């Protein structure tokens, strides 16, 4: 439910800040001093970060999981500072 609105919010900034690379048409205007592509490509920044974090700490967990290390006191550690 909520994961999903903001999968489809990363999406859609995410082709949002490619069809702004790849037209040109965007890059003529500009607001604030800069670009409208480098404004969304920033604010795509912010939320697909968040995702990235997300999925960042989700994919070291795996690779700690999958790591021949079982120390009881890292797993704790790992598990609270995640």
């Not at 489809?8 to 607001?31: E, M, R």
């Not at 920044?45 to 997300?54: A, D, P």
Request: with cysteine.
């Amino acid at each position: 439910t909520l994961a999903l609105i903001e999968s489809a919010f990363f999406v859609v900034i995410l082709s949002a800040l490619v069809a702004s690379l790849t037209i040109n048409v965007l890059k003529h205007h500009t607001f604030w001093g800069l670009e409208v592509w480098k404004w969304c490509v920033l604010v795509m920044v912010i939320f697909s970060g968040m995702l990235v974090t997300n999925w960042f700490m989700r994919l070291i967990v795996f690779l700690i999981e999958t790591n021949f290390l079982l120390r009881r006191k890292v797993l704790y550690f790992v598990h609270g500072l995640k």
